Every structure is written in structure tokens, then in C-alpha cells.
Design a protein around this ligand. Structure first.
Ligand code: NAP
Length: 315
């Protein structure tokens, strides 16, 4: 399938363009190329400081008439430093202004742990400890649901949430809108079988980021596992006349998981989208699933303490 059905009955293109770390002076071209190559799902975030450029690219493609707003599925995320009623709506409106849109198809809590306000993604004290906040994601969720009922957000979702944190929201008194997706790191070394199974059992889809093991992430020792270099994956790729990256991307699609590979390289953007004309066999999917080691490439040590740290739980 080329899309996933959300609980709201809306369609989410199973493949989208990731933009984390995409330099501001390159993401605009990346989005234009992505749209020209066929992408209709763009994943954005306030914390990426590049939404203004994404918005310029979109506006231009709509202006050209190659696409209409309705053809695109735009995703953005609320940063934990803005859980507060006021700061939340300001961050949302700012995201809407930067992207030059009137509504978002999906708005996600970028991280469960509320953080101290300010122009800092991770405010730290004198020692360097990240200052958390009392405001919870349920507090933010209530106001985010307002955006939904006012038609400014088509659906809400979460990112980097373990199943407990999702349970907290599904069973919240007076729940108005259920999350439609949990965006988490997922690839062969971190298959997320339990979390995916838990989400699907609740009618919640899963969006996989860092599908290529994110071999870019700043500070990543040389002898760290490389999914793009693994001979077994390369072998499977070659038999299908595809690249490893295309296999790592196709992997999620066959598990009915949305995947958002990131790139600012026109050629790779093009490459990551040629994943709808082939099928991995049952044995190949098993071989790939067998790579799991619950190894996280993301992981930010400075967050291991936070009460809402989501990676200690089983799933
Ligand atoms: N919610 C969160 O906490 C969170 C965290 C991280 C990321 N994300 C989202 O997930 C998206 C995934 O990006 P990511 O950095 O995490 O990891 P990724 O997509 O697995 O890997 C991105 C890296 O792979 C390179 N690349 C892309 N296509 C390639 C190909 N076909 N062959 C070889 N190399 C290729 C990119 O290089 P070039 O750009 O140089 O081509 C970049 O250095 C992000 O853009 C973002 O939207 C969300």
C-alpha cells in the first residue's frame, strides 16, 4: 500500500520526506525536488529551525499548480519547552506562519518530557542539567485538541512515546482526540515489534524515522553499525535491483509502517522514493527483522534522567 489509514479515516502517505538537520539553505531545494519526484508527505518540526524554507518550497509548488494543499500531508511537532497553554498556541501559530499554511494534517508532541521555557531546546543549569517543567503532555494534549476542533489541525499524534505514555492519554478523562501516530526511531537494529504491535492494537499507526540508521547524526564513533554497508542487506538489495537504502525503506512499508527518510541530496531524495515497485519475500523480511538488537542511534544521554524518559520501559 502507498498510504496508511488513520483512525480519522484520512490517508497518510506511507513514505514522507524527513527534514531533521537539513540546513536552512538546502531544505528548500530538497522539498521542491521531493515534491517533483512524487513526495506528498513532508515531515517538519519547530526544533529543526528550517520550517520557513520548507514553507517557501511548498508555496512555490502550489503556486506552480503541480500540487494543491489537499494533496500534501504536512507534519510538524510541538517542542516540550512550549507545553504551556499560551506558549503552545504561539508555537503552533508560528509553525503555521513559517510553513505558510492554514492548517496542519498532523501535529505531534515532539517529546514527552516537559521542559523549561525559553529560546533553548534543552535549557541547562550551571552544571549542565536540562531544566524540566511541571507541565505534562496531557496538559498540552488538552489544548492541542482545541486546535483539532477548530480545524487548524486534522489529527494529533505523538513522537518518542513508550506505550505507557500512550496509555496515559488513551485513558485520560474527557479524551476528545486519540493520537493517530507514534513517530519513533525504527530500523533493522531496532525493530520495535512490541510498540508497533501495541499501537496497531489501539488503531494507532507508527511512523519510522532514521530508517537508514541515521549514519549522519553528529558525534557517532567510526566503528558503529552501518545498515547501508551490511552485506546481507546489500545482498537482498542487489537481488531486487535496488539499493540498501531502498530495502531499509521498503522494510517499513511491508510492515504497514510510515517511513520518513531524510536527505538534502537530490539524487538520494529521488532514490528513497523508488520503493513501490518491488516486494521483499517473507524470508527476506525475517532476515531483516532478525537484525534486531534494540539499538538506538538517537538517544540523548542528557535526557536519561528526565521523569518522562521513554526508553527505560520495555516498549
Ligand atoms: N522526533 C524525533 O525525535 C526525530 C529525531 C530524528 C529524526 N526525525 C525525523 O526523521 C527523519 C529521518 O532522518 P535521520 O537523520 O533521522 O536519519 P535517516 O533518514 O536514516 O538518514 C539520514 C542520513 O542518510 C543520508 N541518506 C539519505 N538517503 C540516502 C541514500 N539513499 N543513500 C545513502 N545515504 C542516504 C542523508 O544524507 P544527505 O542528507 O546528505 O543525503 C543523511 O546523512 C528526519 O529528517 C526527521 O524528520 C525525528
Amino acid at each position: 500500500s502507498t498510504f496508511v489509514e488513520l483512525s480519522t479515516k484520512a490517508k497518510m502517505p506511507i513514505v514522507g520526506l524527513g527534514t531533521w538537520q537539513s540546513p536552512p539553505g538546502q531544505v528548500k531545494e530538497a522539498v521542491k525536488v521531493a515534491i517533483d519526484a512524487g513526495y506528498r508527505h513532508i515531515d517538519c518540526a519547530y526544533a529543526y529551525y528550517n520550517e520557513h524554507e520548507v514553507g517557501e518550497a511548498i508555496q512555490e509548488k502550489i503556486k506552480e499548480k503541480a500540487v494543491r494543499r489537499e494533496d500534501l500531508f504536512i507534519v510538524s511537532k510541538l517542542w516540550p519547552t512550549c507545553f504551556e497553554r499560551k506558549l503552545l498556541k504561539e508555537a503552533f501559530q508560528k509553525t503555521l506562519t513559517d510553513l505558510k499554511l492554514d492548517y496542519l494534517d498532523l501535529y505531534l508532541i515532539h517529546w514527552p518530557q516537559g521542559l523549561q521555557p525559553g529560546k533553548e531546546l534543552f535549557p541547562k543549569d550551571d552544571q549542565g542539567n536540562v531544566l524540566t517543567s511541571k507541565i505534562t503532555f496531557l496538559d498540552a494534549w488538552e489544548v492541542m485538541e482545541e486546535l483539532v476542533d477548530e480545524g487548524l489541525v486534522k489529527a494529533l499524534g505523538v513522537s518518542n512515546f513508550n506505550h505507557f505514555q500512550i496509555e496515559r492519554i488513551l485513558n485520560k478523562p474527557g479524551l476528545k482526540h486519540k493520537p493517530v501516530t507514534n513517530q519513533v526511531e525504527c530500523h533493522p537494529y531496532l525493530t520495535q515489534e512490541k510498540l508497533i504491535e501495541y499501537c496497531h492494537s489501539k488503531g494507532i499507526t507508527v511512523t519510522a524515522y532514521s530508517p537508514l540508521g541515521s549514519p549522519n547524526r553528529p558525534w557517532a564513533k567510526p566503528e558503529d553499525p552501518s545498515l547501508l554497508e551490511d552485506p546481507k542487506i546489500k545482498e537482498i538489495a542487489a537481488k531486487h535491483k535496488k539499493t540498501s537504502a531502498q530495502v531499509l525503506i521498503r522494510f517499513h512499508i511491508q510492515r504497514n509502517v510510515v517511513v520518513i527518510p531524510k536527505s538534502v541530496t537530490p539524487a538520494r531524495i529521488h532514490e528513497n522514493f523508488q520503493v513501490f515497485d518491488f516486494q521483499l519475500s517473507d524470508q527476506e523480511m525475517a532476515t531483516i527483522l532478525g537484525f534486531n538488537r534494540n539499538w538506538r542511534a538517537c538517544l540523548l544521554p542528557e535526557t536519561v534522567n528526565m521523569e518522562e524518559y521513554p526508553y527505560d520501559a520495555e516498549y
